[PDB]
Design a protein around this ligand. Structure first.
Ligand SMILES: O=C(Cc1cccnc1)N1CCC[C@H]1c1noc(C2CC2)n1
Ligand SMILES: O=C(Cc1cccnc1)N1CCC[C@H]1c1noc(C2CC2)n1
Lengths: 304, 304
């Protein structure tokens, strides 16, 4: 028992981290097979960042301007290209530590682990969720760009995120591994406000099921509700509307605990309406929404 | 910016995890050089667990009864011995992935990362603190025994914890890598209640400094206090007494923010006395105590 914000083991990803330098800018790169993936803003100077013309900036760059270092050894760059907001640097050596991998674009509400890196070196690993407004509430400092988000299915690493920037609001924006930003964000140092950060309702319910499994049951009540009644409450509290797809995904947790999804929605409704009254659930004094139903099942079953 | 419960990258530790089986019991082992470390209760049957005589149980075991598997390859066991509550299985092959390592016995209040494992395979990584009552609030299921806690200083992995058991209270107990339990716990399935779980005051203050650095400043007040006045409040709220050693350790955070340690104690005093009033600090609705002052500096400076 016990329930923690758990990240995937980061070993497979640590073996892919490299340092990429272009001019006076150094950030992180992801070396998979014979390609190094990194944010295209590596070609920018501090002046360029305000309104960069990436196509024009890249014309002035040759393969030899991209310095790629894997630990203490320099990789030879034999090609470069821009795909959306990422650069793909073709190197002459396949990464011997390349794990089995996929590139996936995640949905808002999905969680992933981040291996924060500086100068191609890992500093820490933490669990994240892609917010409904497509930002991530990470922990990143200048130099962390190019750090990646991922999930792992046994031996396959699914890369879903590459860190690009911090919004003036202190939240983070980035792309999938094809270089497409999550949300409306652009790789430019300009005012980019995030939309309403709604709560991921299906995740809060999944976390309430994890609480019941682990012994924290005080919030269980004598009530039930309907999807429509629940959603009136979810709208008032800036929670995502719950759909029948969400109920279906919560099915295994509902079956394991014997608590119908709509009964758990009624417990959630009372918690939204009344608050926690100074009580805690799984050591938290607020409703946690960065555990998906899959995360709860994985953690509560011990999947390796 | 942003502040997360960050674990160390787990790669160096993943390379050490093996599966150890003795009879019908399988748990995790730590392979460093030519030795595999694991909880001695691997020699117990379910009946034995109630009151085991480990010395007598071990007499019936030979090197060939300890099955040690590293991934899909079997290690040959050439010696076995019991050191306190751990078994050391001498194998004929040095682990090629052995990192630079140390065995350290941590102090209550210190934090570490846990690589939870099942059948010698890593499932996740999370950040922990050794509670003042010497328990850890982990996330561990049956089969997780032998999973280890550690810290990393650049290239050196300091192993501090090996998981042994779950108390009837759902909290976790284990040993250092010399097999000595943290706290009064014994490796026996018996009633072992934990003492008062006090709050790690120096860590809460470190986390308040992290909040100020990251922009969350609402809790800063116009007051100050003294160590003695602060400690009267800390005692009432089951917080650890703050010492001048703690103030000294908070020195760099105090210098960076310009907020004197005693002024931050006065903010903490008001937060204990008044609560958060439905507000949050670094996305938390309670006072977080599982970040040491070193963790805050490391995360806020980007140490790799
Ligand atoms: O956000 C960062 C880096 C950073 C800092 C903290 C956390 N995570 C990332 N920066 C640094 C330069 C100014 C600003 C910036 N604005 O746009 C860009 C890129 C073109 C997209 N960069
Ligand atoms: O605690 C665990 C395993 C477990 C389960 C959940 C989390 N972490 C560890 N068990 C399983 C058998 C009964 C009980 C037990 N009591 O003592 C022992 C060892 C002799 C010390 N084991």
């Amino acid at each position: 028992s016990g329930f923690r914000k758990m990240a995937f083991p980061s070993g497979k990803v640590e073996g892919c981290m490299v340092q990429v330098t272009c001019g006076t800018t150094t950030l992180n790169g992801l070396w998979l097979d014979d390609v190094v993936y990194c944010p295209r803003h590596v070609i920018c100077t501090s002046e360029d960042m305000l309104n960069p013309n990436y196509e024009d900036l890249l014309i002035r760059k040759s393969n030899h301007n991209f310095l790629v270092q894997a630990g203490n050894v320099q990789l030879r760059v034999i090609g470069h290209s821009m795909q959306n907001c990422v650069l793909k640097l073709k190197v002459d050596t396949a990464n011997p530590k390349t794990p089995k991998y996929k590139f996936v674009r995640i949905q808002p509400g999905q969680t992933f682990s981040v291996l924060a890196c500086y100068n191609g070196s890992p500093s820490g690993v933490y669990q994240c969720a892609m917010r409904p407004n497509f930002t991530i509430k990470g922990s990143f400092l200048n130099g962390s760009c190019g750090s990646v988000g991922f999930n792992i299915d046994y031996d396959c690493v699914s890369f879903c995120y590459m860190h690009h920037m911090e919004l003036p609001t202190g939240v983070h924006a980035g792309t999938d591994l094809e270089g497409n930003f999550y949300g409306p964000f652009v790789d430019r140092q300009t005012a980019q406000a995030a939309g309403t950060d709604t709560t991921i309702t299906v995740n809060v319910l999944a976390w309430l099921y994890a609480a019941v499994i682990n012994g924290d049951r005080w919030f269980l009540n004598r009530f039930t509700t309907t999807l429509n009644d629940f959603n009136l409450v979810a709208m008032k509290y800036n929670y995502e509307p719950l759909t029948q797809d969400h109920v279906d995904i919560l099915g295994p947790l509902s079956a394991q605990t014997g608590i119908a999804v709509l009964d758990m929605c009624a417990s959630l409704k009372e918690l939204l309406q009344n608050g926690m009254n100074g009580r805690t659930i799984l050591g938290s004094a607020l409703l946690e929404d960065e555990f998906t139903p899959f995360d709860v099942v994985r953690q509560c079953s011990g999947v390796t």
